[PDB]
Amino acid sequence: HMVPMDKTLKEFGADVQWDDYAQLFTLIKDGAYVKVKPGAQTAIVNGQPLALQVPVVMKDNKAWVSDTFINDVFQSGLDQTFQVEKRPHPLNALTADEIKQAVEIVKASADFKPNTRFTEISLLPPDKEAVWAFALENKPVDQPRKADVIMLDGKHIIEAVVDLQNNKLLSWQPIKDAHGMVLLDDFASVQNIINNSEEFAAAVKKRGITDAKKVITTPLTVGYFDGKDGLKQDARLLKVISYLDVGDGNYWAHPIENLVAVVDLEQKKIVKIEEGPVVPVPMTARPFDGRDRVAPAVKPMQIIEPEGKNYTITGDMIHWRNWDFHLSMNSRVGPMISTVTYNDNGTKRKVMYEGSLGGMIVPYGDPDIGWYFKAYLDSGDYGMGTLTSPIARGKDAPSNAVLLNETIADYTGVPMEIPRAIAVFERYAGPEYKHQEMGQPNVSTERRELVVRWISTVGNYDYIFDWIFHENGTIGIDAGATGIEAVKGVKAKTMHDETAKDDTRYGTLIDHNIVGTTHQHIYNFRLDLDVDGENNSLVAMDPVVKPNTAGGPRTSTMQVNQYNIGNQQDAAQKFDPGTIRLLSNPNKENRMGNPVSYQIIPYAGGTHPVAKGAQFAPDEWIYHRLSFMDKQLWVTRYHPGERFPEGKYPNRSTHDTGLGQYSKDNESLDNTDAVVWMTTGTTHVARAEEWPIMPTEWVHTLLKPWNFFDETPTLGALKK
Amino acid sequence: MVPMDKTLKEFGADVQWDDYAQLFTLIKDGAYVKVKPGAQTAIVNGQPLALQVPVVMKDNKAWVSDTFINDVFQSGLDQTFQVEKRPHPLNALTADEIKQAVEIVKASADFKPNTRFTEISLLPPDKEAVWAFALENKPVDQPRKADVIMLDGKHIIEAVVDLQNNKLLSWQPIKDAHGMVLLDDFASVQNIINNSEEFAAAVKKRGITDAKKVITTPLTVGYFDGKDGLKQDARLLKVISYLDVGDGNYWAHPIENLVAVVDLEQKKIVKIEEGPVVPVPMTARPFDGRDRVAPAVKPMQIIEPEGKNYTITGDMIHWRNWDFHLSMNSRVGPMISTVTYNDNGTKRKVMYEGSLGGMIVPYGDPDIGWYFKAYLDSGDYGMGTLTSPIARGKDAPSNAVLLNETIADYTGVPMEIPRAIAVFERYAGPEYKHQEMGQPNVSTERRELVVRWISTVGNYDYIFDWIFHENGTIGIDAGATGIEAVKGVKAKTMHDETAKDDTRYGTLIDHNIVGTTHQHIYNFRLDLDVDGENNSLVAMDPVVKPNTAGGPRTSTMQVNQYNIGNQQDAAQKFDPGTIRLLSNPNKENRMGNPVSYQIIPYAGGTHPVAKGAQFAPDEWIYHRLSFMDKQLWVTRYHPGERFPEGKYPNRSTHDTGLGQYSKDNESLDNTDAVVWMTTGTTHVARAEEWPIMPTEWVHTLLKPWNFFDETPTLGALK
Ligand SMILES: [Ca+2]
Ligand SMILES: [Ca+2]
Ligand SMILES: [Cu+2]
Ligand SMILES: [Cu+2]
């Protein structure tokens, strides 16, 4: 029984190329590079021959394969990219079965109710010392596996801990005052509640909208204003902004300006409609999907690895050159990079226990009724892992990437497999080093980087995060932003109209009747670096110009002021990119007697203007609630429950329960387990080039080995 | 018949054999060729080609006709290079024009024996005429001229020659100018040191048994108002010395605190400065892999089997909506000219000429071997002349096209630099994406076109990338790799007695080796013509202001916008939280905003950033080179103002560069402007950079700012 080759291979997600001159198919998926000729008894997979019982059959210019071809070829074993894990790593995420088990254990208590949802079901952090002992010594972890299960019972948060080995509930703790994140069903509830409101339909009608069934809602968290917003603190509320669907696939281009509904999600009712002046809806079609555009005819470019990859993925463990690390997915913050070591001539040296996104915020700058409260805490309030955007193969990542599927719990407690959740890819990155000595043979080597890429979309914006492993020990973390801008409906068509100056006070006029309201993008990364060990110190090195006291003609010299930063409050600081900040191991030295260190660079560049802090006065509630926005470098003492720069429950928070709190007390940062937090931000002033869709803009951060090694790390293995 | 593997390798093509498909794949620059043994046809960039003589296998080796290379690679099916029927007026001097210019000046009775040539370059025609050629095909009327700058012993003379008419137009000695360092000066310095008994005796005192193992490096001496003891009218170089121990890396064996001053006209050492004796660090530190074995790596290829999206017509590059002209200069290297963006069928001016302006690498140590040390790499040494040929597949990706470029050498003889510039297209992540919840994804791929050039001046190697984005952005990135300039010291580790004094001015990166702290400072000269000649400089400073509109917010995000109408105010520190635009106040986009480019002199870097010059303001280097201490400069277009350090910076007594060009109160309002961007790092060394430094980068950007009406990569409308 035969199937059409071209169609079957495309369903499966393989690239299929036919070469009529060579009479050769080239088939590519992930780590498999396959060559096969019609009628041939053998195919080639990653340079190795594979017998085929049934050859590819060509027949009236149409290829047909066996029913078993895809499994015979792609799952043969000749693609060595993925390997089976011997003993399960203790940081492996919860499996589908473990998720279902956690949900049965809590559903077996008297307290569970059928409206009860799950904000997060995740592995409970096992003991760090034990996890490192498993990674470095293969010591089994004796403590049993547990899950944190965070429930939303109507509006109340409850934290449960389940023991998975012994199948029992270990704790069940109500968290008073905490509001829950926004859950997927809240999007539909809001849209339904608005569709059923007579009051809302009348409001919409007086702003020009004839058909209220064409109104698209979007849910926003309301923040906290100590009652100036007129919103009761006890209630589960969301604000709702509206747009008109005109059939262009881009409702974001048709704001219904100055109409905000406040929805109570327990009562399932609109509890308040805020109405400002009437601004006609911008109606012109502004598709971003190409429906109105001519297709480009570009010549092909492929990045090919025809003998397979240089990395191996064993369960969730990635091995690549001198690097080893574990890669898992969390529903709130997305990818977690753990137990990162560097193999230095046979000895695995610790670099990082856990790194991930801490949290992020996109706060707006306009005081009007549709805007004043508007701030996306994308991970904390919406769940960025849950909103992972599957990688578009060859576009969102290069043609030579491997795309990983990842499993998390949805809000009803059912496993969901996110397809193409993460891309892994090696890339050429210019020369690693070069020296052309005059009159001698050249010396050049190529640089290779391993990239781990993940994309999450929250409403209008799409965020790309790259964790970049350099062969030489450097680690990069880059954050990219694309998607559709949040825009304000205005009366001005051009800057010559009467209202233009007022309409553009808080943002640029980027289309007729459309203003891209000014805002910031602020990302924070939590990096539990363990620089060649647990016990580290924060060291400052400030390059300075000093008077020359040594004689000769110079008046000045270049020197460095070096000092330790021994307490947390002083560690929380602005980053001057002219200075050097190290996390050093004062217990271990390189061959020159210098403490082995990593240099921390929270700002290594970007393509939008940089935020030097929060673009808010210090008496703003958002400023008070979210200290992480205003400093670029923080260092705190390791604590397994201090994970989020915005705090665990940021929705309508009244005070800072994140980095403001974690860095508040002054215990010592001297020779102890430190956690580094980097904040990097931009100030986004809009331009017409960014509308109707924004070209990807990037910010860059770096961690560089600083006397961690004894010489150029990529020179190669010593032959004597 | 000739053997295929041997013949194709001498041609510079990559040959791959696939035994399964019985197929040769042959790759060189824009040609991607497939050919089966015995076949009567081949494929070149996806197109069929009839062969006169099939590829023949003899004893499992392939043989081809002796005409095969011409027939296949020069078939016309590779369309990467097209013939230039009407030459662009900024085309660099050809080999024949260089020889002719030299014969014109040699025919003058004023030409003296042994005269050398510091620079032989096109005298650029009139800017208006050049734009009218590029935009309207209008022939330039005035004839081909060359500037010929001669060094007669130590004396500079500037001549101009008319090449069409074959005559000398002018001959002008330049009073008080010192010439740059020329190739023969390196050998003179070495010879002069080798013949000095006095120097050999000094070397002997410092523990060197064989004085013929001493390697010299020539350095310019700068200017210190006589405090260095040095006569201002003499042609001098200072000489720093190293020991050759046979490891290929003399840089790793400094002979510390010994400096010779050579007078190049007298051909003698005129001064020897001798400081404390520090034993030479002796341990072998090769960087070339003689003592190493690389790990095995699986292959990666970047292939474009239908050819390239760019075409190269003479020196004119066309790619997507971009058109520009690429030429080579002996001092500054590549010049990118007449840059337009094709906006829905209409070519719009972006940049008349952009290039490296100049650069400086100045050191922070006051000791005798260091206080004067400041490499003006382009101005003093000639970075174009010192271009490093691209190592194919390593210095640029495997899908690059490598261009040869021709300049004059110091004796006036044309010199063809093989693989002088790389051109390549690269994948650069998604151009944009939106995954609307519950809807089909929208994603498109980003492509960038990179023009890459490498120059090596002594110990350091510099890489410059000019990056054209499809969406109208231009990036300029500068990379540094090579071997650090190091100081010999007594300390082996930071536990030794001298360690603290030894590391006052740099990190201990090896036993007895300190990487002295210094800066890398680059300046780019960018004659942007934003949709036209007449432009203005506009500041937009995002600020937090009190809320006056009501409701709960105490503050708002607003912008202070203002014009910068004077050159003196235009010379400024760059705050990367602000926006600086070059705007065309005569032309607006669809929303009534002036068409503009945003100038970003600091878009990041991998070393610490220089906020300006790491020098007290009474230092002579600080006074001579103002360009070091501000990141943005804007001046009025003048064809003779091209170098931020000045025309003749060797032993300059005052700033004849950007300090002079920006000095006067003249208007930048609605006039032809030139932007200069200074970007730099402060390099504090580490062990990971020794014996060879992994490439470090700095990034700059020019972004269209309401130049267009919408997302520029959406495509043309149906
Ligand atoms: Ca730590
Ligand atoms: Ca201009
Ligand atoms: Cu934005
Ligand atoms: Cu340097």
Side-chain angles (χ1 to χ4, degrees), chain A residues 7 374 457:
Chain A
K7 198 178 201 187
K374 192 191 289 190
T457 303

Coordinates of all heavy atoms in Angstrom, one line a residue, chain A residues 7 374 457:
Chain A
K7 N 2.9 14.7 -0.6 CA 1.9 15.1 0.4 C 2.2 14.5 1.8 O 2.1 15.3 2.7 CB 0.5 14.6 -0.1 CG -0.7 15.3 0.6 CD -2.0 14.8 0.1 CE -3.1 15.9 0.4 NZ -4.4 15.4 0.0
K374 N -2.7 50.8 31.7 CA -2.3 49.7 30.8 C -0.9 49.4 31.0 O 0.1 50.2 30.7 CB -2.6 50.1 29.3 CG -2.5 48.9 28.4 CD -2.5 49.3 26.9 CE -3.9 49.7 26.4 NZ -4.0 49.8 24.9
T457 N 3.5 34.9 22.4 CA 2.7 36.0 21.9 C 1.6 36.2 22.9 O 0.9 35.3 23.3 CB 2.1 35.6 20.6 OG1 3.1 35.3 19.6 CG2 1.3 36.8 20.0

